[PDB]
Paper text:
Protein arginine methyltransferases (PRMTs) are important therapeutic targets, playing a crucial role in the regulation of many cellular processes and being linked to many diseases. Then, another series of compounds (12a–12h) were designed and synthesized, introducing also an adenosine moiety and exploring the distance between the three groups. We also report crystal structures with various PRMTs supporting the observed specificity and selectivity. On the contrary, we were able to cocrystallize the compounds in the complex with both PRMT4 and PRMT6.
Numbering used by the authors:
A (entry chain C), D (entry chain A): 136 to 478
B (entry chain D): 136 to 477
C (entry chain B): 135 to 477
C-alpha cells in the first residue's frame, strides 16, 4: 500500500508487464558489466554473505540470489512483484536450492517477511539512477534490515556535467519544422510548430556520446542507501556549480551514475559513465531551451530539481546561469517519456 | 460505454497517450503512400463528399477532415479521444475552416452528434489490419451513418501466405538458446528453455521482406465495413488452403492487408503488400516453433483464429498441416508483444 | 594373449586393418607431400642415424619409410605390417632390388618376433588429435626391440589446443539436431529424442581446417616423449590447460592440432599439422561445446581434457572448461570414433 | 542363430553401430521419396492395417510402425537389433502408443514374437537391392506371417542396363597410374600399378548419372517376397540379353531397383531408377575390365552372378559378350567396398 499510494494503477501494470518477459531478463543478464560486477561484489565480499540472511528486492529471474547462494548465504528471501517470480521459482527448484532460496511473489511493501536480514541486495537503478522510482522500494525494505546490516549497493552517485552538442540541439528544430509549411497536402501546419518544439524539448535524450562534448568535471550528488529514507527521494534537489574547462555553447546537462558495493573486504564500483563500456542504463541528456555561452574558467551554476510523480518517474526542472555574464536558461522535462536516440 | 467495457483502462491510457504526441502524428503524416493515397481516394471521389455531412473517426491532427473539406464537404464532425483533438482544433482555426470542420473531443462510442452523416472516413487499420481494435470503433460509428451511406475505406483484404526464411527462424531460435545454458555465471538456466522459446515465438515479427520468400499464392480474407458489425471482430476465423508452389521448409505465415475506397467516381486501393512501397504498417510474420516441410504441389491447410483481448489486441492461434503427410503445426501468438525487426 | 588383442575389440581390428589394406588409401597418404617429403627430409638429413644401422619400421604400409631408411644407408630394415598391404610391400622391395636390406615381417608388432634388437624405430603412428587409432601404443610397445642407445623417429609429439569461436560451425551442428524438435514429422512427435540428438551431434569431433583468426588465446601444449613414455601411459591421458583470453566473445570449443619432431644427430626436423601450416591428411580437430562459454579478453579459461582409451582403438574424451572469473563451466563428451568430416 | 551363422561377428558390429546413430535415421527420414512413399503405401492401403497385427523388421526409429498405427493397426511388433531400439521405445512412449507398438530389441532371427502377424513391413533394400543382405532377415521373418499374409514391400525389381561412360572408365587408370612412376621420392612404384587397377575395378560405383548413357532397354530381375526363401538370395543368377539401341563402346552395367507395395486397395511403387528423383540408394555401376563395341541392333548377352559373403554383401561376377562379334569381357567386383563418387 505504500507502493499503491505513490503509483498509478496504469503505470504499475505496464511496469511489471515489462519485467515479466524473459527477453528483458536476458537483456539484463547479457550485460556483462552489470552481471559480472554484481557477481564480483558479492563473491569477493564473501564474509558479508557466508551463513547470513539475505533479502533480494525485485529478484527478477533470481540471478543475484544465486550469487548470494554462491557466497554461502544461509537463507535468502527473494521478492519479485512481476510474473517473473514463477520463473525464478523454477530456477530455484532446478538448481537444488529450495532449502536456501525462498521466492516470495509480491511487492516488497506488501509481502510478509518472517525475519530480519543481515544484508539487502537489489538492482533498483534506472535511467539517471532514479527513474522507475524503485530506489524507494529498496529503501522501504530496510524495515527488514537488522541494525548494523548492509546494503548492496551501499551508495549511489549521480553525476551531472554540461555538454555541447550543436547537432543534437538543432535536430530538435529540424524535426519540429516539419509543421512549419503552409501547404502540407494543402494544409497549413504552421500553427503547431511551437507545440512540436515544446514536445521535443520535454524529452530527455537516452543514448551515449563522446566524452569530448563534456565541458567541465561532473558534479556528484550522493545517496547513502544505508542512511537515506525513501522520503528523501520524493524531492531531489541537486545543486551544481561547474568550473568550465572548455569555452563554447552549453546546450544542456548530461547524466550518468555509479553505485558502490561497500563490503567488509573491499568496495566494488559499477559505473555507467561515458568513460566506461556502455550499459543498458546508457546515459541521459537534458537540453536547455537556449544555449549558454561559457568561457573556460567561468562558472555555470544552478539546480536540477527532480520531483517524483505517480508515473514511477520524475518531472525534471533544470535552472542554469553563467555567473560571470548572468545569461540564464532552464528547461522542464518529463523523465517518463524519454527519446531513445542511441544508434 | 462499449469502448470502456472491451478495454482495460491501463491499455487505453497508454493507447491514447501514444497518439497524443505530435511526433507520432508527424510520423504517420510523413508516410507519403498513406497520406497521398487517402487524399487521392477522397479528392478523386469528390462527388461522394460535395455538400455532404462527414464523420471522421479518430481524426488525430485532422488531416483527413481537411481532405474532406478540400473535396467540398458541407460539414465534417471530427471525433478524437486523445489530447490531439486540441491541436486539430488549432489547425481548423488557423486554416479558416471553423464553419466546416467541427472537432468533437471524446470516444466515438460516447460522444453525441447533432445529425446523421453521409460518409464515414477513418484510418482504423493497425498491424495485421486488426491490431489496436479500432475497426470496432469504425464499425460502431455506423450508428451515425444514414441509410446507404458510404465508408472510406469500404473494405479490407487480409492476405496470408506461407514463407521460408531460415535466417529469421534461426535468429529467434538463437535468442531463445540463451536459456539452455547449464552454467551461466554458475547458474543452470536450462529449466526455463521451454518458456523462453514459447515467449520468443509468440512475438509477431514486424518488418518487410523480399517477395521471393513466399511459398504459395496468398489467401484473401475480406471484411466489408459497410456490412460487418463490430461484434464480428471479437472472434475472427480465417481458414486457408495453400497450393504450394515451391518445395522446402515453411517457417510460418506472412500477413499484410489492402483497403479499398470504393467511391462513386473510382475505387482507390491502399496496399501494404510486400510488392508495394513500404508503409508504417510494414508486414507481419507469425513463426512456427517447428518448421513444416512441404513439396511443390502439396496443400497446406489450417485455420488462423484471432480472438480479441482487453488490451486492444488479439490472441492469435495458427493451426497448419501438410495434408499429404499429416505434418501438423499448432502455434499461439501475442499480437501485443511484437518484435520490431526492420 | 598379445597386448594388441587384449586392448582391442577384434571387430575394430578387422575393420581397422582392412581400411589400410587398400592401395588407394596408401596413395592418399603418399600423395600428401608435406608428410612424405618431411619424413624423407628427417631421415635423409639425419643419415648418420641410419648408416649401417638396424631399423624397425612399425606399420610400414607400402614400405615408403623403409625405402627412405635404405636410401640413408641402413644395413637392415625390419618392416612390420599387419594389414594385407604387407604383400604389396614385399613386391616393391623385390622390384627395387632391396631384398638384401628390407625384410617385410607380416603381423602385428606386438605379436611377431624380430631376429635382433634395432638401433632406431621409424613409424607414422599419429591419427587425428595425435592419439586416435591408438597406434602410438604399438609404437611404444615396439621399444622392447630397441637397443639401450636407441632412438625413435618421431621422437616427441606436441599436442596443441586452443579455444576458438566459430558461430557458423556451432549453428551448423545445432541446426542438424533441430530436426528432432519436430512435434509432427509425418504426424510423428520426435521431440522426446531432441536431447539425445544434440548429445550425439556434439560428441562428434569436427575434422576440418580453419583460419587461425578464430583462435582466442595462445595454444597450450602437451608433450609426449616417445623415448620415455610407456605403453600404459596412453590408457589415460590428462591434459590440463589455462588459457589467457586475448579476445572477447563466445568460446564455442577447443581446437586441436599436433607437431612431431624427428630429433636426429645432425638436426631436428619438425612435422606440423598446425592451422598456420599447409594442410595435411590429419587436418585439425575441434570439440564443440553444447553450450558456448562467454569470456572477456584477459579472463582465464581453465580445465582439463581427459582421454580414456577404449577397446575400439580410440578414446572417450571429456572436456570440462570453465571461465575462472565467472564460474561459467562447460562439460562435454566426445567420441573420437565418430568424427564429422567437414572439409 | 541364422543371422550369426551367415554374418562375421566383425561385420555385424560395424553394421549395427552404423544404424544406431540418430543422424543416420535422420538422413533416411529426410529422404522424402523413401519416407513419403512408405507412408502413402501404408495409409492408402488402410484395410491391410485396420485392426491387423503387424511386424516391423528393423524398425530403426520406428517411423514405419507409426505409419502402421496411423493406418489403424491393432498391434505392431517393431524389431530392431541396433541400439536405435532404445530411441524407438522413447518415441512410442512419448507418442502415447505403448498400447499398440511393442519394441523388441534384438535380431529378428533370435527374438521371439508372442503371436503370428497379418502383415510384415520393412525397409530391407540396400544398394543394388541386395546389398547388406537384409532381405534374408525380411524373408526369415515370414516364419511369423499368417497363411495368406502380406509383405510390404511385396516384390522387388532389379534393373540392369549397359552404359557408356568413357570418362568414368579412363578415371580408373588415371588414379592407378599414380603407381606407374620409377622414382616416387626415389622409389619405383610401377610394380603395383596392375594391383591398383584391379582394386579400382573391383569397386562398384555408387553414383547417379544422366539416362542418356544407357544404350539398351533395361532387363528386369524380380524377387517375389511372398514366395522367395532366405536361401534364394545366397546365389542370384541374372541372365540378360540386351538389344542395343545405340552404337558405341559399352563400359559396364548400371543397376537400380523398384519395389511394389501390393495392397488390397492399390499398388504403390518406390523406384530408384535414374529417371526418378534421387534417393539415398542412388544407382550402381559395375565397370567392365575391357569395354565392348556394339552396333545399334547388336545383342549383348551374358550373366550377372551375385554370391553372398559373410561381410553382409556380395561378390559380383559379370560376363558379357557381343553375340554378333564374339567380343567378350568379364569383371569381378566386391559390393562391400563401393566407390562413392556422387557430389
Ligand atoms: C513511456 O515509455 C517509455 O518511453 C519508457 C519508459 C520507461 O520507464 C522505460 C524503462 C525501461 N527499463 C530500463 O531502463 N531497462 C534497462 C535498465 C536496467 C534496469 C534494472 N533494474 C530494474 N529497474 N529492475 C527492477 C526489478 O525489481 C522489480 N520490482 C520493482 N518494484 C518491486 C517491488 N515493489 N517489489 C518487488 N519487485 C519489484 C521489477 O519488476 C524488476 O524485476 C526501458 C524502456 C522504457 C521506456
Ligand atoms: C513491443 O513494444 C510494445 O509494447 C508495442 C506493442 C505494440 O503493439 C505497438 C504498436 C504500435 N503501432 C503503431 O505503429 N501505430 C502507428 C502506425 C499505424 C497508424 C494507424 N492509424 C490509427 N489507427 N490511428 C488511431 C487514431 O484514432 C484515434 N482513436 C482510436 N480509437 C478512438 C475512439 N474510440 N474514439 C476516438 N478516437 C479514437 C486514436 O487516438 C488515433 O488518433 C506502436 C508501438 C507498439 C509498441
Ligand atoms: C566418418 O567417420 C568415420 O567413421 C571415420 C572414423 C575414423 O577414425 C577414420 C579414420 C581415418 N584414418 C585416417 O586416415 N586418419 C588420419 C591418419 C593419417 C595416416 C596415418 N597412418 C597410420 N595411422 N598408420 C597405421 C599403419 O600401421 C599399421 N599398423 C597399425 N597397427 C599395427 C600393428 N600393431 N602392427 C603392424 N602394423 C600396424 C596399419 O595397418 C597402417 O598400415 C579415415 C576415415 C575415418 C572415418
Ligand atoms: C564398409 O565401408 C563402405 O565402403 C560402405 C559399405 C556399405 O555397405 C555402406 C552402406 C551404407 N548405407 C546406405 O547408405 N544405405 C542406403 C539405404 C538405407 C535404407 C535402410 N536399409 C537397411 N538395410 N536398414 C535396415 C534396418 O534394419 C536393422 N536390421 C538389420 N538387420 C536386422 C535384424 N536381423 N534384426 C533387426 N533389425 C535389423 C538395421 O539396423 C536398420 O535399422 C552407407 C555407407 C556404406 C559404406
Amino acid at each position: 500500500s505504500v507502493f499503491s499510494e505513490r503509483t498509478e494503477e496504469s503505470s504499475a501494470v505496464q511496469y511489471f508487464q515489462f519485467y515479466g518477459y524473459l527477453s528483458q531478463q536476458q537483456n539484463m543478464m547479457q550485460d556483462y558489466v552489470r552481471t559480472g560486477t554484481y557477481q564480483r561484489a558479492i563473491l569477493q565480499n564473501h564474509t558479508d554473505f557466508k551463513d547470513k540472511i539475505v533479502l533480494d528486492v525485485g529478484c527478477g529471474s533470481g540471478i543475484l540470489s544465486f550469487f548470494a547462494a554462491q557466497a554461502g548465504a544461509r537463507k535468502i528471501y527473494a521478492v519479485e512483484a512481476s510474473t517473473m517470480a514463477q520463473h525464478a521459482e523454477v530456477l530455484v527448484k532446478s538448481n537444488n536450492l529450495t532449502d536456501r532460496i525462498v521466492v516470495i511473489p509480491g511487492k516488497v511493501e506488501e509481502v510478509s517477511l518472517p525475519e530480519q536480514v543481515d544484508i539487502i541486495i537489489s538492482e533498483p537503478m534506472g535511467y539517471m539512477l532514479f527513474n522507475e522510482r524503485m530506489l524507494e522500494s529498496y529503501l522501504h525494505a530496510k524495515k527488514y534490515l537488522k541494525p548494523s546490516g548492509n546494503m548492496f549497493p551501499t551508495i549511489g552517485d549521480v553525476h551531472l556535467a554540461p555538454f555541447t552538442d550543436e547537432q543534437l540541439y538543432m535536430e530538435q528544430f529540424t524535426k519540429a519544422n516539419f509543421w512549419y509549411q503552409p501547404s502540407f497536402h494543402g494544409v497549413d501546419l504552421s500553427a503547431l510548430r511551437g507545440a512540436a518544439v515544446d514536445e521535443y524539448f520535454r524529452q530527455p535524450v537516452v543514448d551515449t556520446f563522446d566524452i569530448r562534448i563534456l565541458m567541465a568535471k561532473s558534479v556528484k550528488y550522493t545517496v547513502n542507501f544505508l542512511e537515506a529514507k525513501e522520503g528523501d527521494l520524493h524531492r531531489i534537489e541537486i545543486p551544481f556549480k561547474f568550473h568550465m574547462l572548455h569555452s563554447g555553447l552549453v546546450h544542456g546537462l548530461a547524466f550518468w551514475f555509479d553505485v558502490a558495493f561497500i563490503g567488509s573486504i573491499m568496495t566494488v564500483w559499477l559505473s555507467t559513465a561515458p568513460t566506461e563500456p556502455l550499459t543498458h542504463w546508457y546515459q541521459v541528456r537534458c537540453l536547455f531551451q537556449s544555449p549558454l555561452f561559457a568561457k573556460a574558467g567561468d562558472t555555470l551554476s544552478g539546480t536540477c530539481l527532480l520531483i517524483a510523480n505517480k508515473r514511477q518517474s520524475y518531472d525534471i526542472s533544470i535552472v542554469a546561469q553563467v555567473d560571470q555574464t548572468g545569461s540564464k536558461s532552464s528547461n522542464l522535462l518529463d523523465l517518463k517519456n524519454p527519446f531513445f536516440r542511441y544508434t
